UniProtKB/Swiss-Prot annotation, chain A:
It is found in: Cytoplasm; Nucleus. It comes from the Eukaryota. This is 26S proteasome regulatory subunit 4 homolog. One of its GO terms (cellular component) is proteasome regulatory particle, base subcomplex. GO terms for molecular function: ATP binding; ATP hydrolysis activity; proteasome-activating activity. Changing residue 155 to Q: 73% loss of ATPase activity. GO terms for biological process: nonfunctional rRNA decay; peptide catabolic process; positive regulation of protein catabolic process; proteasome regulatory particle assembly; proteasome-mediated ubiquitin-dependent protein catabolic process; protein-containing complex localization; ubiquitin-dependent protein catabolic process. The 26S proteasome is involved in the ATP-dependent degradation of ubiquitinated proteins. The regulatory (or ATPase) complex confers ATP dependency and substrate specificity to the 26S complex. Has ATPase activity. ATP binds at residues 149-156. There is a cross-link at residues 160, 181, 216 (Glycyl lysine isopeptide (Lys-Gly) (interchain with G-Cter in ubiquitin)). Keywords: ATP-binding, Cytoplasm, Isopeptide bond, Lipoprotein, Myristate, Nucleotide-binding, Nucleus, Proteasome, Ubl conjugation. The lineage of its organism: Eukaryota, Fungi, Dikarya, Ascomycota, Saccharomycotina. The chain holds residues 75 to 437 of 437 of the full protein.
From Swiss-Prot, chain B:
InterPro entries: 26S_Proteasome_ATPase, AAA+_ATPase, AAA_lid_3, ATPase_AAA_core, ATPase_AAA_CS, NA-bd_OB-fold, P-loop_NTPase, PRS7-like_OB. GO terms for cellular component: cytoplasm; nucleus; proteasome complex; proteasome regulatory particle, base subcomplex. The modification Phosphoserine is found at residues 67, 134. Interacts with UBR1 and CIC1. The 26S proteasome is involved in the ATP-dependent degradation of ubiquitinated proteins. The regulatory (or ATPase) complex confers ATP dependency and substrate specificity to the 26S complex. This is 26S proteasome regulatory subunit 7 homolog. ATP binds at residues 153-160.
From Swiss-Prot, chain C:
It comes from Saccharomyces cerevisiae (strain ATCC 204508 / S288c) (Baker's yeast). The modification Phosphoserine is found at residues 12, 21. The chain holds residues 167 to 993 of 993 of the full protein. Residues 13-25 have a biased composition (Low complexity). The keyword Phosphoprotein applies. PC repeats lie at residues 251-283, 284-321, 322-356, 357-397, 400-432, 502-533, 534-568. GO terms for biological process: proteasome-mediated ubiquitin-dependent protein catabolic process; regulation of protein catabolic process; ubiquitin-dependent protein catabolic process. One of its GO terms (molecular function) is enzyme regulator activity. Present with 306000 molecules/cell in log phase SD medium. The keyword Chloroplast does not apply. The lineage of its organism: Eukaryota, Fungi, Dikarya, Ascomycota, Saccharomycotina. This is 26S proteasome regulatory subunit RPN1. GO terms for cellular component: cytoplasm; endoplasmic reticulum; nucleus; proteasome complex; proteasome regulatory particle, base subcomplex; proteasome storage granule.
Amino acid sequence: FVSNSEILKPFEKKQEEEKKQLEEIRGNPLSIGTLEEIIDDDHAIVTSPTMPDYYVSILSFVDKELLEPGCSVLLHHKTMSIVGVLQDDADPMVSVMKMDKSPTESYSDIGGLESQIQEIKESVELPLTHPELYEEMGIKPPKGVILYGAPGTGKTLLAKAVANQTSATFLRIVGSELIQKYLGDGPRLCRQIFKVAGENAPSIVFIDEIDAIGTKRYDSNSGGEREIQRTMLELLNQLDGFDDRGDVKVIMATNKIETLDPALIRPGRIDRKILFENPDLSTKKKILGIHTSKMNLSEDVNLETLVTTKDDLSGADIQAMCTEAGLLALRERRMQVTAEDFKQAKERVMKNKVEENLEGLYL
Amino acid sequence: LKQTENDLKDIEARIKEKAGVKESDTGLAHPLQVARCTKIIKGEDAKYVINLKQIAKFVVGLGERVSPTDIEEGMRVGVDRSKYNIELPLPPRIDPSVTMMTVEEKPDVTYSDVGGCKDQIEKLREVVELPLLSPERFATLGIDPPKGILLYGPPGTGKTLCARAVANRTDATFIRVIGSELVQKYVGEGARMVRELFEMARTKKACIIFFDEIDAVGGARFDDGAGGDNEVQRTMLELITQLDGFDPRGNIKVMFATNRPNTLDPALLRPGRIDRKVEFSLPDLEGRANIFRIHSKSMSVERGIRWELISRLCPNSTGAELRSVCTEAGMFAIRARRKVATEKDFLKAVDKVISGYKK
Amino acid sequence: DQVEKDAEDETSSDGSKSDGSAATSGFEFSKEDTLRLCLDIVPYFLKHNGEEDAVDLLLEIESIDKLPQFVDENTFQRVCQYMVACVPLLPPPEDVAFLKTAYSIYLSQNELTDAIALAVRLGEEDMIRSVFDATSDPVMHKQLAYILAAQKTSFEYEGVQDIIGNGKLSEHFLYLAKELNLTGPKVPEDIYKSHLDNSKSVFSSAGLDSAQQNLASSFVNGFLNLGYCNDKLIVDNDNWVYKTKGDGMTSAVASIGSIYQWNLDGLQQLDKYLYVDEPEVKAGALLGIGISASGVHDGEVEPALLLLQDYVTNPDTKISSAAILGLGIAFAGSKNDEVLGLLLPIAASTDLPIETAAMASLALAHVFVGTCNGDITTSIMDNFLERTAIELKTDWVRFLALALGILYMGQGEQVDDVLETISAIEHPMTSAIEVLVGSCAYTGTGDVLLIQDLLHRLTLAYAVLGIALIALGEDIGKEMSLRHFGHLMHYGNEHIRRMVPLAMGIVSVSDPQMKVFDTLTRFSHDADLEVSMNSIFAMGLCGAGTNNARLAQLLRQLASYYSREQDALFITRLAQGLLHLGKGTMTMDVFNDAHVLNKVTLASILTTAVGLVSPSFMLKHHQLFYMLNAGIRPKFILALNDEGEPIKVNVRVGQPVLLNHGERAELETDEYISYTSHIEGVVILKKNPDYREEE
């Protein structure tokens, strides 16, 4: 306040000549629109979301090189004349746009996935954190990454953990939003994804849970659609046309890649296929160590005691099993789970859950 | 001159607002993306008075007039979607589509990923290279070059660099128009760009007009017949009138690329327009060796590697997977911590392709 | 709440060596009833060994007097590991001053781990030497000597070097005669000079024809060939040397000094142009010797730089200009009253045709930085206000005040001499100096008051110096600094505009950022043509040591400048020669693993800010482009056995596939166990007693 009063305040107070009247003569009101075409004759065409498309003129504010068609600019309401230029982010691009900063997940909180960490790191984090390794080899790092698993563990923890170490903004695009059920929205929304990340590139593109655009079938029925056929082709042109050192990656995870277009596959652009694997007992020790730092455990029970019984659970239900372990202690009126509570809590978990039995009694 | 541009807002900007807006909006109404007029009485001769919006449509009677430059006032005179009478000479041809069409005269691409495609080059030698080199031979032969050449194969493979490989031997002009922007059902979008291709092809002889992803264009779609739009309805007429109807063959050629012939209108599929069909097959060992040695110059490799062995262990594969072998070879080298790619690095890259593809 | 309010108003730093004082004299800190609260939690965590959570209680309330009380008995080991990962930052605010009180209670004990933490952070002169008192192993003191040469600061000048550097026999010294030359860049730089012979790359250097365009070739000759000896251009074809006269001849031989740099002797190599006829030929000779002597102070087997002190004062014109700049770079780290006594009358009268004091103001700053002197700022203060002798022009008066932005570092209460100059003659740069001189009184940065005082200035050109220091050690002040740097690029004077790319360019090797690179669009073309010429030189310094990689975005700003005219050739080549500086592969390191900087390198950073006038307005001498050699740190890593003698050792390779003594490497992590104070770069490893190995 003291500095701005003795520095920035006298700058505007002492000398007032121009920049005050630039927004006056042209017009006071403002109606946002998009430039259709730009020329040197000081005339253009603007269209507001209400569709009052007219033919107006141009006055000199910014040079014509800065004015580009397809971006939101500074306009007038009634006369619709161009009063300036604005930022293009006001133009609606994708119906669902989620930009997350500082993701909470990291490599330490995802457990024993280091087998799959080195895979996702080499195709995403390694070219971002070490661009000189792929430059000396004279090769282009893979842009895409194929993932397998379930939401919350395989298709979630792996995506958010990389954005933390890469210091990139988390950008999520729903796979179903790529197809709006309208002809022409397929190629339009795909180009706008690379446009936001195509300036400073301080982010990484993430797409999860594709049950739709991943399968075009043979027709517009049986789960496929005709707009999906031509949308996956334009995404290929946007994948090859996109060129950088790896600051931005496109990570898409679906259930099956057999229905994908061999064009969009394009071997050499996507070198990474990560299939969901069943973790070993060492994975549970890393997940327990996080929650045992808060919840106190008895001295007679260590990390080797809880890992004894583990049946088909990777990383997700270890927290859910410890939730019941802390809930049973509330019945005994105590805030610290002791050895008597561990035995009765794990029996209520491992039992009465999975009805189907995989057993070697086929004999 | 620096301070001169600042004070013109007090003088010149007064008339520019009236001449650029009020004169255009006169009567409740240069690149033109919109045109309309409301309640205007003129005179029969260049009267216009047409509302381009689908609401309150107007026409023009009393004879026929042709004014391609300026019909009456310019400005709010326009056409856009529907044809009305004598308004045709002034279409709104302005559009920022310059990023779609790519015009390259005499490309220098010979063999990069198309190494081993000489089987398809021989298919393109008689129907492309022959009419674009010595067209006078057909006078002695008596036959005719095909009006068009159709490309077929795996999606996203062999439909790009193979078209520019034959263009080098012909010294022709390769014009690639991506059909992704022609997918729109907007009236007049498809027929306008196709018409301009034959116009520029008449100026310079021996040119190649290439349509990328004709499945995105085609002769008919669901929004053509079931819809009230002439998009693709008048576009096929441009291929029938220009190519087969009037424009010559050896001077003006047309090439298509599709993922399947059944997506095209049989009217264009019948002989006389689209005749030859080029199918992309899998290159042999000789084709894989010529592609790997070219990529080995860009990527750092060991001076003692031999591509005549590891490439032989891999069966016939697509041209897209061959570039993947060179990229995946460096990935195992990073894990092995080597400045170059040894012979063991290429072995792990091929085994990754064999286990995940089996093509 | 009482500590936070008392920390906002104080005349001193945080922490004290008196544990029995109630702090009731002068500024009041602890109350009368709070004396018992200081000992309350001490005995509880003492028996249970709960110092992990006990220090966290001190980190929140900022109590320096409790820490020495927790040390009594039981485990002195595990308490040291909890001090490294907790004390530096528990809360959002950062206070590193809690280690000062530990020097008193650990004075007779310390620890292997504790002596590491007492030599970092504040790094008091008595606290740095505390690692040598506890450890009696002479092998451990060898590895500590490689760190002391990198740290400098406390023990640099006479009393350790030139005295103990000849060897000493005692328990707490143990400094071998080899450890003097081997740790610093003295012997290894000559061996490393031979490795660059086979490691040389394709060179674009040439001699061209006319002396007018030889300035563009001389820039490519010296910087691209730095570290590599070239006898083809220097010996055979003199057209790029002899044809140049005046300032061009000074920069011509200055290119020769960098070619012969990092050699056993930089004098006899330049004796060809040392004494011939005119002082113009004699100018660059003494300039190149000081450049070739960068990194060495007392010599190897002889004090070669001691005899060069007589060339500081010369009545000749061109010699004195190139002697002060060249010798001022080589004399860094060596404190001598003879060099001080010569430079005081030169910078006093500021005689242009004779003394050439333009570089004399920065000579005192580049040499005596890091030492404690109150007389060096007193003579300049009296000459600043009164303008003694023939001093007239106000620019030379401002050049003194700009040079005053260095000497007060580490002087403590002696910064008052700078405050008197600010109140004497008002300058645009001196407005922000009075705020940042207080950081020397607190013996560090990162205080809540210091961060709040910087916000008082921003919400002017010099105030961003302390902001970049906090951004490197704290991520909280770093995230906001990127927002403030965008709004500070619009100002009347061009000082603040050119400091933004230079501050991020030096640290661009550790943490490159593309946000500042795209802001150079307005920095390349703004108003005056001198900005466009300095922009190419600024982008070259941002790209020195790294070829492309994340600097491809910086290369896009360079693509706008290719070729215009003959005079524009040297303008555009400014970035090209700096990208190929050191054969294109090198590193610039102003820091270490001790979380402290090097005051000698920081002085060269502020010296180029005050200097580099030739690419800017009012061109003085062409020798100002070679000033970057003062801050260039040699890139090497030694491979040593358990005895510290040079030998081939098989370990993790650095940045060059075979690591040996004097091999180029840098920025490489080391997970192997070392003796004392594990540090990256040069390190002496060992093996557990179960096996005998060199790894």
